[PDB]
Amino acid sequence: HYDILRRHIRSEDLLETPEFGSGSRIVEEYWIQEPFTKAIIVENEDEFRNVYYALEPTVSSEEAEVISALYDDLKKILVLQDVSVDLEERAEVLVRAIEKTDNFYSRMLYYLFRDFFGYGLIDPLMEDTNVEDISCDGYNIPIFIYHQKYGNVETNIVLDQEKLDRMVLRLTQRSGKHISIANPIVDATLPDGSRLQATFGTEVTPRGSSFTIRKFTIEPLTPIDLIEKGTVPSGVLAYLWLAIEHKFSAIVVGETASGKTTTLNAIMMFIPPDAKVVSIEDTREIKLYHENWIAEVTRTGMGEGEIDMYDLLRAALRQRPDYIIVGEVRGREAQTLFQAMSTGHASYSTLHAGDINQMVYRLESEPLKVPRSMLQFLDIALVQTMWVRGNTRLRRTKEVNEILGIDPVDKNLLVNQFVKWDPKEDKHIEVSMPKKLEKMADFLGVSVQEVYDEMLSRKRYLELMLKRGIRNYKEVTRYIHAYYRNPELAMTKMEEGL
Amino acid sequence: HYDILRRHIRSEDLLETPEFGSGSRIVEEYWIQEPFTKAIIVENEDEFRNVYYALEPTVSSEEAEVISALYDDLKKILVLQDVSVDLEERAEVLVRAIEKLSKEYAVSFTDNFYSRMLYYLFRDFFGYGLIDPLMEDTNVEDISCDGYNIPIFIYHQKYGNVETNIVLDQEKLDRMVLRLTQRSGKHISIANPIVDATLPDGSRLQATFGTEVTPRGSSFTIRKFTIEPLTPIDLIEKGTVPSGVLAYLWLAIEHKFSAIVVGETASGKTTTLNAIMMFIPPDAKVVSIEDTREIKLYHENWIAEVTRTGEIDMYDLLRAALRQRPDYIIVGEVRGREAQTLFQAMSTGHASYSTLHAGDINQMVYRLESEPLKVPRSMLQFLDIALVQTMWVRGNTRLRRTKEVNEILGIDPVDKNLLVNQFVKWDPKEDKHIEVSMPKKLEKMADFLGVSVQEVYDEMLSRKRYLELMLKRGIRNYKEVTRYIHAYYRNPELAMTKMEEGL
Amino acid sequence: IEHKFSAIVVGETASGKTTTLNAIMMFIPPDAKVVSIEDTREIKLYHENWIAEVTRTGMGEGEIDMYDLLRAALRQRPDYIIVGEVRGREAQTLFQAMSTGHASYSTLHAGDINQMVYRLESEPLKVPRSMLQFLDIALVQTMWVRGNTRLRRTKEVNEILGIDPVDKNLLVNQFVKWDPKEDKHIEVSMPKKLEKMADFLGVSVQEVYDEMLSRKRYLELMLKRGIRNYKEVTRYIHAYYRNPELAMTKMEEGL
Ligand SMILES: Nc1ncnc2c1ncn2[C@@H]1O[C@H](COP(=O)(O)OP(=O)(O)NP(=O)(O)O)[C@@H](O)[C@H]1O
Ligand SMILES: Nc1ncnc2c1ncn2[C@@H]1O[C@H](COP(=O)(O)OP(=O)(O)NP(=O)(O)O)[C@@H](O)[C@H]1O
Numbered sequence A: 001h002y003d004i005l006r007r008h009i010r011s012e013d014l015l016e017t018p019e020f021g022s023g024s025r026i027v028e029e030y031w032i033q034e035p036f037t038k039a040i041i042v043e044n045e046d047e048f049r050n051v052y053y054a055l056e057p058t059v060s061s062e063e064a065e066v067i068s069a070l071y072d073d074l075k076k077i078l079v080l081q082d083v084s085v086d087l088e089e090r091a092e093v094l095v096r097a098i099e100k101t102d103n104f105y106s107r108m109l110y111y112l113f114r115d116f117f118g119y120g121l122i123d124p125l126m127e128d129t130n131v132e133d134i135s136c137d138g139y140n141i142p143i144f145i146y147h148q149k150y151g152n153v154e155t156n157i158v159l160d161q162e163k164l165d166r167m168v169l170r171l172t173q174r175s176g177k178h179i180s181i182a183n184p185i186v187d188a189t190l191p192d193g194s195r196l197q198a199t200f201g202t203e204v205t206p207r208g209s210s211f212t213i214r215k216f217t218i219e220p221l222t223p224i225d226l227i228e229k230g231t232v233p234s235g236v237l238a239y240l241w242l243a244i245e246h247k248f249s250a251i252v253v254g255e256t257a258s259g260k261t262t263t264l265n266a267i268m269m270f271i272p273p274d275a276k277v278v279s280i281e282d283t284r285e286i287k288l289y290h291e292n293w294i295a296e297v298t299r300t301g302m303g304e305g306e307i308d309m310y311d312l313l314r315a316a317l318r319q320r321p322d323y324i325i326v327g328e329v330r331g332r333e334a335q336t337l338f339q340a341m342s343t344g345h346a347s348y349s350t351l352h353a354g355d356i357n358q359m360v361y362r363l364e365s366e367p368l369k370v371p372r373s374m375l376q377f378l379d380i381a382l383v384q385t386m387w388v389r390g391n392t393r394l395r396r397t398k399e400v401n402e403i404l405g406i407d408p409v410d411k412n413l414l415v416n417q418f419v420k421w422d423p424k425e426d427k428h429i430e431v432s433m434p435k436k437l438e439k440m441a442d443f444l445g446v447s448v449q450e451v452y453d454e455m456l457s458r459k460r461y462l463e464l465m466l467k468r469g470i471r472n473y474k475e476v477t478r479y480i481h482a483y484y485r486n487p488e489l490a491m492t493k494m495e496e497g498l
Numbered sequence B: 001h002y003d004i005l006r007r008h009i010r011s012e013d014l015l016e017t018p019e020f021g022s023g024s025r026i027v028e029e030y031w032i033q034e035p036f037t038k039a040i041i042v043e044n045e046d047e048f049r050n051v052y053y054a055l056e057p058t059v060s061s062e063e064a065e066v067i068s069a070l071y072d073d074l075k076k077i078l079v080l081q082d083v084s085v086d087l088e089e090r091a092e093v094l095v096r097a098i099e100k101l102s103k104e105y106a107v108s109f110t111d112n113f114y115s116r117m118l119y120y121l122f123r124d125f126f127g128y129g130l131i132d133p134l135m136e137d138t139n140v141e142d143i144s145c146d147g148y149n150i151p152i153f154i155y156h157q158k159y160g161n162v163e164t165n166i167v168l169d170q171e172k173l174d175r176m177v178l179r180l181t182q183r184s185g186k187h188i189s190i191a192n193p194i195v196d197a198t199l200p201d202g203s204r205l206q207a208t209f210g211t212e213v214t215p216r217g218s219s220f221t222i223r224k225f226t227i228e229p230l231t232p233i234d235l236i237e238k239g240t241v242p243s244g245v246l247a248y249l250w251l252a253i254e255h256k257f258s259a260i261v262v263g264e265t266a267s268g269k270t271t272t273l274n275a276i277m278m279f280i281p282p283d284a285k286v287v288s289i290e291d292t293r294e295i296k297l298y299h300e301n302w303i304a305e306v307t308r309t310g311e312i313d314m315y316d317l318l319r320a321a322l323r324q325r326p327d328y329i330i331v332g333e334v335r336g337r338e339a340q341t342l343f344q345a346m347s348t349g350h351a352s353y354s355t356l357h358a359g360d361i362n363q364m365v366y367r368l369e370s371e372p373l374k375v376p377r378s379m380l381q382f383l384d385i386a387l388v389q390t391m392w393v394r395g396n397t398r399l400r401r402t403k404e405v406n407e408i409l410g411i412d413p414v415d416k417n418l419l420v421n422q423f424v425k426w427d428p429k430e431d432k433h434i435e436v437s438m439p440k441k442l443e444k445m446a447d448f449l450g451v452s453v454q455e456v457y458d459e460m461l462s463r464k465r466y467l468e469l470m471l472k473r474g475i476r477n478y479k480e481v482t483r484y485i486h487a488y489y490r491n492p493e494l495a496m497t498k499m500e501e502g503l
Numbered sequence C: 001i002e003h004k005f006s007a008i009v010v011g012e013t014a015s016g017k018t019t020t021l022n023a024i025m026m027f028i029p030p031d032a033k034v035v036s037i038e039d040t041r042e043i044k045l046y047h048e049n050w051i052a053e054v055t056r057t058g059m060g061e062g063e064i065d066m067y068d069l070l071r072a073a074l075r076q077r078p079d080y081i082i083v084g085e086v087r088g089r090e091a092q093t094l095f096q097a098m099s100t101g102h103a104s105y106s107t108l109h110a111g112d113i114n115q116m117v118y119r120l121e122s123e124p125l126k127v128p129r130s131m132l133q134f135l136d137i138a139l140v141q142t143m144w145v146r147g148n149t150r151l152r153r154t155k156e157v158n159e160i161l162g163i164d165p166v167d168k169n170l171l172v173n174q175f176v177k178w179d180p181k182e183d184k185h186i187e188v189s190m191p192k193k194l195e196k197m198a199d200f201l202g203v204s205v206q207e208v209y210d211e212m213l214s215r216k217r218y219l220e221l222m223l224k225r226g227i228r229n230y231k232e233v234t235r236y237i238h239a240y241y242r243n244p245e246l247a248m249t250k251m252e253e254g255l
């Protein structure tokens, strides 16, 4: 959208500078869509809070209706709104059509685009990858957002009745729905691939029409990342890399906000480049730099057929995939998962609990109701934690539990604890042997020492990526995919900064 | 409504002075809505009791007949009797229409009889008719009309149960019920004679039609809805909840502990929830789902969702809202299916709060676990606090009191019993709340912060002091209270100083 | 009854249950709002602020049972609730009403507190064991015959003290017992409930005990003066409620 534009423009010194009266300090400033929009994070000494200010090329009140006029005509051009047309061409017409200062030109095309190809009033928010949530509550209420770093902050964008009503139609339409007083609520998904709740009128929202947008922008923490944060030691990560390659199933358990999903997504970047993976989640959260992958998302059924995790797994496990990822088990679908395990599908997921005992309880009891005897097919179960002191915010893998199996005439769940985390020294201690490594020698058909050797090898590879500052997930997945293809060549490039 | 009327009034002094024979002595008088209505608590000393007298602008057998005459014509107009229309403009469609009928029939009334007839037309058109005065008087909390020819009884905020002078006969009462019923979107009739609805303003209605299931005639009962939200200060001042418990709750909702306030129907459950819901941190994202708009908050980043009875239910809205990233979710009252969903929101990290109809905590568990709600036992663990409201009655006094505060620790490993801790219990005897123990939830907070339990506790006392300072300074209204609380959030010490320093 | 202690009248068929209930229901405070739910009218009350609700058979319309009627009555948050006789599900709602402070009264077909407990706990009634604690008093009515000697007597006045943790459960203190050999009512324990009244009222026991003896005198006087009718009786009782002083004097001065 902006590359096609930003060239058709003439000037480059568009948009002036911000002017905030006293008590309105400027915390930070950064670009969004240079050189059009820029965002400024202002403070406000009185109310210890920061505020998000959305900057766009300032215009004249004469240029107002002027630009709103050039638009009143370009609107009656069906060949513009048509999405069937590639944006590259569509733009051209708008330009040519506009032919019928060398600075006012550019600082104008911006809008003409922001309203035909952009998202309008909220484009600055849709484009900024720091804003992961947009909340337009009601008529004449300043929009709020969730900043990647600032969190909840008020915004300089407000929409009066009509301005918002049309906004809600714009979003609703681009998402492919027809919100009306007859169907005032829409829970669809925008083209950019984002979750949009929307309400028209005031029948359900006395505070007027409204909308919310949860942007899938994430930037998933990486295995290397976990090593840096001291969350999981490099050696444990290698053990998992192997485990994951061999299809040992794992569940990440932990108190709410302790790290479960992050860790999962992190270690899910260890999946073999060619393996077919299918994921089922209630809402997108998992980012993977993997191709042969199908992502399935649950359906609310607000106004259609409700398709839950159970429905989605049952028909996915049917495509007989290699790896199966279930966002988090919160019910019935849990049975199907363990069934998938008993069958050899490398299955992974999350579970809200504090220790293996709670894990077992939740899994066995309704709603999950996973049969006691099925637990044997789970291989590893990690336990994540949050640890705090000063502003000391720590997320750690409290423990790496190896589920050995079931016992006949028992207590049942046989667990061998490999790694334990001591908080007193913030250290991970080996408190038993990694038995699973033995099951690998059996799979692979080699000796333990041999496997142990590869672990130490894979371990080195990770510590190197760390030293070389290879943090991003896209780049990390590339170097791991690398190692899978040819560990020899992979290792050498790593040691030779390439 | 009346400010509009007070405009066109065209005069004042429309009320005379009642004639209560001996064996009757005025105890107190007061405008309900001057210069039209006025309440006069009269003491029939022979029967040693009082008797609420709704006083309205006087009219003669001839006058009322004339009034009723205009009503018949004006009745033709639909606009003025249409709810979707702005009271203000249809209030003129009325005066501008009475102008017509007047000048046309070539007649000019008295400046007074106008500022009297006008009152009645607005009343029977826009207001609540015969019971409007009761529906207005801020002191009446309940209105109870037992049947044909039986005097309406009300509950006066100061005299409690009292006999009223307003009496509806069959013809009048049946209309009254149909009107109230219709006015609530619901329908009533001999086919289906019982109705449980809520009036446009929130007041809860319980009507009955004919003598079908209710001999003695049709009947109704209204439980008015206070327009101004009681605040945690109001609650400390009313002896309904200790400032300590309140401070405890402040921290709890700040730290996103999910809680449900339990109680009998009309025990003041919603009122408490709305009060403590003022402790929500300022920038957080609040989403509220209700069947009846009731909760009033001074919180900008909040979307108020409302049920559609036709069709959109709480369940739909709840699961919808849950696909976003709201910080706080308020339900108002879980009555069915969604109760499951609401307990999951808890499970997945959402600060969730709601009202529930039950008397004990035992009954809470039972009502939760069984149909229609059907919440699995393993899920209750995710509820943090459970308050219990009670409306204690002794003589001509009613006391809404937080009868008990419970903490849900967890689920016992044996028999999977709910681990609960009742740290505060009310005592009807001395009307004193008692701390049977210290909150165990304080440790969960300490960890979530990395501070010692001792450190959290002192923070509590601080907020507690802040609350009592606000009280002592007479800061009661919700907008201003919310304002001062949001402050303590932004900066505590600066907030404390300014409090004890008069600013 | 004034203090809202809930009571159930139990007894064999035709022993007097309903009569006794209706009788003692004439002790309800003149201004209190009372709602009654019955399968068929039987209760007569000389009370104004009262709503009488009657069940619907549904012969050709919508069937509305006692459950439906109570559930929406207890909703009007009344002072006193009267249920003709509990014969099922609606019994749960009643005891719920009790646990909540609604002075609730009703009848139950049974011969002794043991049968009462069984019937109430078991289906169709199925009232949860733990809820029984909210019932205050339970009277037991009887029929006694010899020659043409037709007698209806309150066999016993049982005070339900409460529940026991780790128990047998229903704690009952028997206040009065009826000896048929001499046709006399014997006190076989103290009226504990009078103590709960001192606590409610905020006075001493002796004080309450005094009022009892007072109210007792008032009744024996109405008797001596032949004030039998319910309309007239309810008037003199309503009287005493308004002003016991003035009430007592008129009584002693045949007016
Ligand atoms: N190891 C870590 N180091 C630093 N921050 C982390 C770490 N793990 C998670 N976080 C952050 O902590 C927050 C917690 O979310 P996350 O831990 O992903 O979900 P969760 O609590 O496990 N729940 P779920 O997503 O339902 O499984 C996110 O904002 C993460 O970015
Ligand atoms: N603490 C209080 N002090 C005085 N009046 C109160 C108090 N709390 C509530 N009320 C009033 O009591 C009535 C009860 O209202 P509310 O709390 O909304 O209902 P509820 O107990 O939730 N019952 P329901 O509406 O049946 O679910 C209202 O008229 C309130 O204004």
Ligand SMILES: Nc1ncnc2c1ncn2[C@@H]1O[C@H](COP(=O)(O)OP(=O)(O)NP(=O)(O)O)[C@@H](O)[C@H]1O
Residues within 6 Å of the ligand: C011, C012, C013, C014, C015, C016, C017, C018, C019, C020, C042, C084, C085, C107, C152, C153
């Ligand atoms: N104390 C009494 N003295 C004389 N006759 C009585 C007395 N109590 C009841 N009766 C009469 O005995 C008959 C029994 O009816 P009643 O005792 O009212 O009902 P019940 O058997 O208790 N059943 P129910 O009405 O379903 O509770 C009636 O005709 C009454 O008039």
Ligand SMILES: [Mg+2]
Residues within 6 Å of the ligand: B269, B270, B271, B333, B355
């Ligand atoms: Mg409520």
